Design a protein around this ligand. Structure first.
Ligand code: FAD
Ligand code: HEC
Ligand code: HEC
Ligand code: HEC
Ligand code: HEC
Length: 560
């Protein structure tokens, strides 16, 4: 393993700050500083390559040591989701074993009394979009902030986002001639979530839309290309120019503005217990390399994201999903909830679990809803349609599940490809089948040519504005410019709509006293209420930025 190959050279000293060994802090800044000093940084190594592991869509600081492990085998972090078969020096298999947030309780207790190490104003749990947005906001005229992330790299699921951040009205919307109104945000969001959404929450998720999309803009962002996500009316899923993805883009812009103000960001740092006055007093952090430690603070923003990804838990509410795959990064396992629950927080809609209908088994990645949005039709194993491709995710997941072999085929054109740049990525991953004709496409896919062609030529007729098969309301493009493409997709656990109970101010309410537990804040996928029982495409990112801002600001007034 790497540190032995380097022990052979000059010592412990090479990397560690001292000759005895040991890490100073959990971000591992010294050591990574030593990596770069003899090997160069990522740009340098990226430039040197001919798909390289040293240059990717990942956002924020990506330590060398997140893959190049000192005292143990090393693994590309890319293998959490892809199977690139990189040949990593000192290689190993990617493996994560979920460990309870409460186990090693003696140790945690032994460690809570054992001093008091640092004190800050406001602690933020997690570095996706809700956590960084809170960082900007707490920090931005207010307090001191210490943000902890347990992964070795930042941005959670936020950074994988593909399809857009919903916004209403006054976004750049003006500029494209897209006519839209606030109440039409609320109203499709109540419709989408089957009318149980907390109405006050959906309201602020409507009424702050525009400013969250202006905020991002005050910061360096690019929210100007707009599309159609399943379930809304007037077009409104904001994204970067020409069909790229908002996630990475938003994460990155929030990471830099968070780092640019004075946030104290720390990776390899899991919050495992909120500190009990019962007013929140601090937090119990297990730094992966520095051990346990207390942070005293006056406000705790919980922004830990969802639990999709923990198949043990998801299978506990909806065992249909047992064994299913997830579209999430490896950190969305429910830690956050557990920490909050321990602190006596109330929750709601924990059982409504969103499965994304078009995940790719072969690539280990979700394939954006925008591919259907821009014109793709979906086809079963027989060669025919079976659904209104822009329906709600739950109905779309269900119909593919009810099909010959449990999977289905996205089929689109050269015209749909051109028009949605996320498609270049799928092409880059080698997961896209290509036909010079539909007959050619059929052979690759193993679906029958006459039947698929008849399907496509009929779908074209529907395209003539009427889908006399399945009612699809929008028929954007015809599907007639060669070459023609296909990808088999299937449903995968994606988002957990439920979670902690919070108000419009981001406060968390106690189960027992049905009022706020003091100084306890929360924002993002870890909360419940915003999406009722079904989340609309593009409402996650809008929820997270709006609600992070509110959670950061609320927490700063607290302590002030
Ligand atoms: C593949 C994919 C595509 C999606 N695309 C879109 C889209 O295009 N538009 C849209 O609106 N929505 C989209 N969604 C939904 C959107 O991504 C939200 O679900 C996601 O942004 C959640 O934001 P968050 O801040 O709550 O959490 P995350 O981004 O998950 O950030 C989470 C931080 O907490 C860290 N953490 C967890 N527990 C602890 C702990 N105990 N201590 C320390 N750190 C901890 C986690 O590792 C995590 O990084 C997408 C989701 C996925 C997975
Ligand atoms: C200078 C004193 C170094 C520091 C600090 C680190 N590394 Fe290193 N590394 C160094 C040398 C001179 C070599 C040898 C080349 C040879 O052919 O013998 C290496 C080797 C590696 C490798 C190579 C595996 C291989 O393909 O042969 C890797 C992946 C590597 N080093 C990574 C690495 C990391 C992650 C470090 C930070 C902890 C780091 N090195 C420190 C010199 C020095
Ligand atoms: C995971 C995404 C990685 C991160 C972050 C870093 N490295 Fe890397 N490194 C990784 C792989 C999978 C490989 C080898 C396989 C391949 O096909 O590239 C490497 C290779 C190296 C090497 C040897 C090759 C070379 O060009 O010298 C070195 C010295 C090295 N890596 C060092 C290094 C440093 C200094 C990093 C921080 C900037 C770093 N790696 C990040 C995987 C990943
Ligand atoms: C799970 C959290 C991932 C990790 C870790 C890495 N990638 Fe990824 N990657 C993931 C998704 C969900 C997507 C598709 C997004 C979309 O627009 O639908 C991707 C995309 C790619 C691509 C193609 C598109 C592009 O932007 O080039 C490549 C080449 C790719 N990913 C490679 C890659 C590497 C080298 C990684 C290690 C640094 C890596 N990914 C991490 C999911 C996840
Ligand atoms: C660079 C290649 C290293 C050398 C030569 C040594 N270590 Fe060492 N160390 C390195 C890294 C990247 C880490 C972080 C975690 C990981 O395993 O990747 C560490 C961490 C440690 C520890 C903590 C143990 C743990 O919980 O994993 C110790 C005790 C430590 N480092 C000591 C140490 C000693 C005594 C060394 C001399 C032989 C030494 N390390 C070499 C990177 C490197």
């Amino acid at each position: 393993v790497l540190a032995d190959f380097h022990g052979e050279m000059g010592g412990c000293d090479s990397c560690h700050v001292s000759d005895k060994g040991g890490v100073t802090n959990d971000n591992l800044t010294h050591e990574n500083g030593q990596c770069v000093s003899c090997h160069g940084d990522l740009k340098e190594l990226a430039a040197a390559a001919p798909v390289s592991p040293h240059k990717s869509h990942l956002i924020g600081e990506i330590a060398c040591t997140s893959c190049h492990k000192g005292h143990e085998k090393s693994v590309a972090y890319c293998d959490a989701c892809h199977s690139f078969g990189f040949d990593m020096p000192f290689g190993g298999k990617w493996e994560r074993k979920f460990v309870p947030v409460d186990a090693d309780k003696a140790a945690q207790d032994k460690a809570i009394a054992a001093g008091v190490k640092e004190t800050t104003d406001v602690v933020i749990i997690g570095s996706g979009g809700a956590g960084l947005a809170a960082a900007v906001s707490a920090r931005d005229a207010g307090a001191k902030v210490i943000l902890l992330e347990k992964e070795p790299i930042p941005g959670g699921n936020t950074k994988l986002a593909a399809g857009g951040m919903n916004a209403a009205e006054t976004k750049p919307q003006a500029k494209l001639g897209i006519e839209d109104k606030k109440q039409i945000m609320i109203d499709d969001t109540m419709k989408g979530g089957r009318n149980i959404n907390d109405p006050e929450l959906v309201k602020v998720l409507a009424n702050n839309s525009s400013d969250s999309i202006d905020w991002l803009t005050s910061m360096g962002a690019d929210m100007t290309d707009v599309g159609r996500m399943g379930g809304a009316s007037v077009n409104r899923s904001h994204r970067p120019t020409g069909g790229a993805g908002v996630g990475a883009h938003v994460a990155q812009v929030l990471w830099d503005n968070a780092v640019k103000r004075g946030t104290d960001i720390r990776l390899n740092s899991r919050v495992v217990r909120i500190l009990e006055d019962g007013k929140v007093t601090g937090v119990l952090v297990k730094g992966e390399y520095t051990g346990y430690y207390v942070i005293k603070a006056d406000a705790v923003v919980i922004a830990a994201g969802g639990f999709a990804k923990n198949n043990e838990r998801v299978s506990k509410y909806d065992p249909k999903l047992k064994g299913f795959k997830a579209t999430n990064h490896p950190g969305a396992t429910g830690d956050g909830l557990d920490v909050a629950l321990q602190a006596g927080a109330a929750t709601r809609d924990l059982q409504y679990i969103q499965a994304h209908p078009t995940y790719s088994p072969a690539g280990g990645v979700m394939i954006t809803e925008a591919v259907r949005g821009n014109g793709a039709i979906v086809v079963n194993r027989e060669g025919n349609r079976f659904m209104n491709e822009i329906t709600t995710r739950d109905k779309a997941s269900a119909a593919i599940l009810q099909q010959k072999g449990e999977s289905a085929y996205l089929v689109f054109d050269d015209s749909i490809r051109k028009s949605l740049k996320a498609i270049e990525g799928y092409v880059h991953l080698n997961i896209v089948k290509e036909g010079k004709t539909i007959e050619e496409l059929a052979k690759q896919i193993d679906v029958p040519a006459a039947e698929l062609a008849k399907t496509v030529t009929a779908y074209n007729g529907f395209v003539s504005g009427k889908d006399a098969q399945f009612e699809r309301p929008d028929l954007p493009r015809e599907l007639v410019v060669a070459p023609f493409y296909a990808l088999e997709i299937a449903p995968a656990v994606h988002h957990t709509m439920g979670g902690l109970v919070i108000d419009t101010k981001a406060e968390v309410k106690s189960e027992k006293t049905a009022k706020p537990i003091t100084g306890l804040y929360a924002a993002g996928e870890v909360t419940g209420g915003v999406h009722g029982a079904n989340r609309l495409g593009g409402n996650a990112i809008s929820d997270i930025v709006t609600y992070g801002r509110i959670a950061g600001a609320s927490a700063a007034k607290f302590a002030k």
